[PDB]
Amino acid sequence: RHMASIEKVANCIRCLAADIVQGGKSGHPGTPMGMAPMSAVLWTEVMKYNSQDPDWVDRDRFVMSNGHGCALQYALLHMAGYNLTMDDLKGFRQDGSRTPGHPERFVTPGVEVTTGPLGQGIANAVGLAIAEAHLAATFNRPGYNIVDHYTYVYCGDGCLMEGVCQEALSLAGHLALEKLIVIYDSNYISIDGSTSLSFTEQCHQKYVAMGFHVIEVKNGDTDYEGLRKALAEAKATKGKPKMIVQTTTIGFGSSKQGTEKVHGAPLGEEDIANIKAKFGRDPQKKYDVDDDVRAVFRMHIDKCSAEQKAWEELLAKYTAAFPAEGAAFVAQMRGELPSGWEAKLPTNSSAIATRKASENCLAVLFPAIPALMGGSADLTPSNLTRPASANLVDFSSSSKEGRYIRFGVREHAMCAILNGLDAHDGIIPFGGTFLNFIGYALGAVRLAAISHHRVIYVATHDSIGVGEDGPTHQPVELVAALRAMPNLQVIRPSDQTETSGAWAVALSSIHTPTVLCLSRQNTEPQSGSSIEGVRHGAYSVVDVPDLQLVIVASGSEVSLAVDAAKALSGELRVRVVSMPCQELFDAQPDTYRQAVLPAGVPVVSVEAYVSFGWEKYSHAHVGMSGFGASAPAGVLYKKFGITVEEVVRTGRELAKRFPDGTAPLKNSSFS
Amino acid sequence: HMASIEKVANCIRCLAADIVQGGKSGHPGTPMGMAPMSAVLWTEVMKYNSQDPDWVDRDRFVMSNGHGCALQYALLHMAGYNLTMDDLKGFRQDGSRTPGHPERFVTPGVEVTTGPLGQGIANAVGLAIAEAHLAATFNRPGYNIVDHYTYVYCGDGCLMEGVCQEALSLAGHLALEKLIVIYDSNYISIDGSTSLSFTEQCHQKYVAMGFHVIEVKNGDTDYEGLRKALAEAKATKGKPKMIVQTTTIGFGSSKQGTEKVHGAPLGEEDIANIKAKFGRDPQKKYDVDDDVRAVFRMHIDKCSAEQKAWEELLAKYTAAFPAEGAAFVAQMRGELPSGWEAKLPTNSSAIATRKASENCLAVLFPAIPALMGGSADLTPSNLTRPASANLVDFSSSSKEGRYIRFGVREHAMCAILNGLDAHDGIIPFGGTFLNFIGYALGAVRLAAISHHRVIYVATHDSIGVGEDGPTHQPVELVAALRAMPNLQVIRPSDQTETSGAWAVALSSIHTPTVLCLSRQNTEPQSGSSIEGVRHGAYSVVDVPDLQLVIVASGSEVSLAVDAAKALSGELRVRVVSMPCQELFDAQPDTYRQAVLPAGVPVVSVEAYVSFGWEKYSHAHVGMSGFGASAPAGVLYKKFGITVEEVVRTGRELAKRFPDGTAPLKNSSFS
């Protein structure tokens, strides 16, 4: 029944964090010890959450952007009563534990997104805040405040130095995300040592200039009243995102506090013993949480638990007065798609750019899938991600119900924000940009793959087809890179029908991110295209019995393969295989793959990209050998030898070299 | 006659408009908006010689907002550079010297290749660092042989990119006083008004970053203000400068001030009206008044005299400082002092290749004075600052320092390395964890495209990282870098190969190199050799009439060697070390055939995904997905990257494809 003082709670946190890192013989004790005071106040007095229900949809979201200090989050999750035991803590950074080196979504209860790569968390948080603001504007009604929570995000010096972070904070300021509260742990230390070695900005002046309401707590090591007031002011102030700048001593309490030595290595048994004694704690007991400290957390959680119950009742009344909205709310938060959407997608007609084919799909999808939310990185009129017929409204501080986000020229932040939007629940996010600049955001793309986020990237201008912009704008090696990436779908549709198929696949992939590679130039529609085919990854668009050659292609090059096949009609019986998504094809059973790419039959692949990686399917490739050039698309295709005649010549030589079932077996056949 | 500054600017505007119109593609907006500032900068302030684009002490000019390159092409022509009116008429056309975006080497006077937003600014920071460092290294009392400014144009898009923000942050921290950023603020982007996604108080923001911000409220017609801004910029010391000029995109056009003039030809009619509005002939295109040309010529004559005087100063300097003079000339040519390779370390004890790299740098730093490196806040992990080198950090108070603390800014670091290389006199390298090179692919791609000699010291190359987990363990990045044209990805197995890797990187004048280094110790191989690394792949363990080949790289070579020994009684096995696939593919067919003979089954071993290995091996022992959080040793067993797994795979392969029946690889019959 006795309640520990806020200081006792803070010191308990500091020590548990230290023991966690020590037990793992690896980790970062520094930051966790420095942010303990703020965490104590935040987790036992301010933040709204239920440790018995991590899935409560109206809970405040918490994100630790400086993921290396996750020992702190694990300690807090345990003390608060989440399903994370002392055994989990003792398994820190060890094989198969629920407590890996950096926060991982799904691995640990209470962790919203996976961080570690600096700057990502901050951008994820911006996405989490955008989601709350948009859903509140969409579902809230007079007398029914069913969506109302804050987004709290910890970050360090490392985070602020990263461009992805600067991009996100910039957009957050512009969007005036008032419920976003960034807690910046300023302790003047990084791996190299003092921050003055490479980072000396007037942060307060800087973030105010970016539209942030900055609140300083000069002594974040012991000023509990300051910490309390800072959070209260942050919640009270409106119209701007907040940034609480607390000045703290990294590794506070340790003999090596305030130095880079406590950044990423265990403090050691002796130093830990002195730290405990210094705080008046037993220097002999490890992983020891006082029962009166647990009582403080329990009292807080009981209050929030009551809030949830009260919230559940409100949603019940809400659902009664608004049957339809209630059903939608429940449906969106589950990520369910209104039925009948796929059948509404467009099919081939006139020759158009798959870029336009994507727009035609969004013209149908926006109205059919209210959860859909997306935008472009200042390439709206180029990516064609905002169909006029959809009558879209831009998301802004003055129109939070808007569904189109103007990301500005911020590819990296855009992709990281998409992860945040997905992590929230109730949103199906997509973002557009030129395929070549997805390279600017591979840091976020990788995390979408690791965290199993359903995010969609509308990547237009996918090749030399771009034309005049030149080599710096023409991808030739990026698709290969994305294809090497685990759990990532890279779909390159050939026409309207395959494009609708691509969106269908992207939308139904609940745990896999998808890159839609779209062309700038028109492509000729194929009569053999189908959504069912796209779902299989690869399939025949042109078949013939007892085939002597297979020509596999994707996107804008399928027409070349088809024409090449015609030109070879009299000589060879050629099958043309459209392969929009290699990841889906590889996942098909052996019998299906054997039926598409029969062993022993020579295969020629055609794609305006480098050949790297194609050896797993073809015996010869007609594509790029280097970077592009500045000239009209048509000129570039002839220039680089990516033509029908070249395909015909290559197919002819292959058939000649490997006649009747003698084509070299590929690794997949005997693997 | 001497055209007034306004006539010069209007001439620039019209030529840019005709250039874009002639290509039936391009961006006329920004070019027209920055004509006024350009007229002043190029005919009154900037020091350069159009008759000698290679003059080493010339001011540098970068157009970070590369889409508006029509402006730079117009300026280069009017200034007298080797770019004719025909080149201009070839704008955005096949094989012309005037591509859609500035391309290094393709056009005279273009310092770096821009197009991808934010890169130009970062490059400029690198150019400014190089100048400051070279000045501190070579200047002597009375001998100011290195002294020039770095001018860089940028727009709203540039300032929104993280790589730009990272670079400006470091520029402010380093107090690069000779860096002058000219920011064209016209409140317009592709989507339209900047108020749709960009509303920062730039003045206060950049002052907070350490910049001296100068504003020119009317950059469309206030020439006195423009002249004053540049003058103030040159006079103000201790901080980089950002001149914020407010202009009207497409000034003069009927669609001025709108996104419509952003990236589409103005049209024949609007162009005619623009000329008439400026008192110019609405019928003549690509027309440069002779009095405007005389203005540029007068300026170039002066700068030309400055170069000659500079050449004389360098001659006196060389007479008073024989050694330094020789070094200056040599460095500016990118020449390496002889004897450096022979000093590199060879195998000894088992150490991480990360440590092996440090041992190399301990020799290279003192042997190659032009060498300048740093790490993205990972110095104690990348081991890029060998204590014996007695290095000093580059800072505003120590410009002669050779080590750069980039902070947690991988992207800007890489773009800055490109800028350092573009300047001349510097051999740059930057370090960070391999996994985060992924944050900098934008700049890495341009190093490959522009043929920059930059070296990336990328440590913690795999699950060898251990405890940090999947977010820090690369499994797919190397494949991505291998797919990239003109990029060398070297993964040395031990000290000797690591010395070979550095040798290759340092001698590749036109190709960037990524050094994939291990965190954990690796076992040295008696078969390793520098000659082998230069060949990409070579046998480290050979046997006559082989039945199986095991190819591997980096820390996995020891697994292949041990697997080979384990198979001793069963199969005749050759072990191939493949530290660099790019160099191997470049070898003649006879050499490749000799290393990986056709018909012989091949097993590759590497702690990365298999994507791409099919071009060499018939089976792969490596990663099938992302990593996990646990000690390295535990991870290798967990994922099956062990000697027993290699032995088991080699056995099944030799069994399935005995004596010459192994499937032929594409390269063999290609």
Ligand SMILES: Cc1ncc(C[n+]2csc(CCOP(=O)(O)OP(=O)(O)O)c2C)c(N)n1
């Ligand atoms: C993108 C990225 N680059 C580099 C790293 C390596 N790294 C981990 S923590 C860190 C610096 C930590 O500094 P900071 O955020 O200031 O806090 P500290 O824990 O030292 O207080 C770095 C560079 C990383 N995790 N992510």
Ligand SMILES: Cc1ncc(C[n+]2csc(CCOP(=O)(O)OP(=O)(O)O)c2C)c(N)n1
């Ligand atoms: C990294 C990157 N992302 C996107 C683009 C596409 N792009 C080219 S220009 C531009 C708009 C930039 O506008 P700005 O520099 O503000 O000036 P304007 O010419 O419209 O005045 C965009 C988004 C690009 N070139 N590079």
Ligand SMILES: [Ca+2]
């Ligand atoms: Ca810090």
Ligand SMILES: [Ca+2]
């Ligand atoms: Ca602009």
